[PDB]
């Protein structure tokens, strides 16, 4: 019901045969035109493997309102301005999560080097204890 690329309701959906995923023809077409693979499985796929799906009943047109068109223009503008910020926040958070992952990995690398000195001190303690 939702294409696993754009999140939009597919008006001409097609299924991938290497990995079971109903995607959008145009988005999948651009993805295959850049690189010959599947965006989910990273498997080798081509255009001719695609099997055009038919979903005739699902289509429901949005009857927004009687609301005047001059307000509809500002509606579209507001939604575009909101989608831009939803795309901005979705990337800054990823960059910050990658930075935090590396910052935790650095301590993960330091801890095992502290453990070497700890084990050396423990060996020293047992070497004194046996004597």
């Amino acid at each position: 019901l939702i294409c696993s690329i754009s999140n939009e309701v597919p008006e001409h959906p097609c299924v991938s045969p290497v990995s079971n995923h109903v995607y959008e023809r145009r988005l999948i077409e651009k993805y295959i035109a850049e690189n010959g693979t599947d965006p989910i499985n990273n498997q080798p796929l081509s255009e001719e493997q695609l099997i055009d799906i038919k979903v005739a009943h699902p289509i429901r047109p949005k009857p927004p309102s009687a609301t005047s068109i001059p307000a509809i223009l500002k509606a579209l503008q507001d939604e575009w301005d909101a989608v831009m910020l939803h795309s901005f926040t979705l990337r800054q958070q990823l960059q910050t999560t990658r930075q935090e992952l590396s910052h935790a990995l650095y301590q993960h690398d330091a801890a095992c080097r502290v453990i070497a000195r700890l084990t050396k001190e423990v060996t020293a303690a047992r070497e004194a204890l046996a004597t």
Binding site: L73, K74, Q77, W80, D81
Partner: peptide
Amino acid sequence: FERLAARQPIELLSMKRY
């Protein structure tokens, strides 16, 4: 709506936010 906007003439409000 087109005839009202023409007789009225006053073009519909556009996106002055971006």
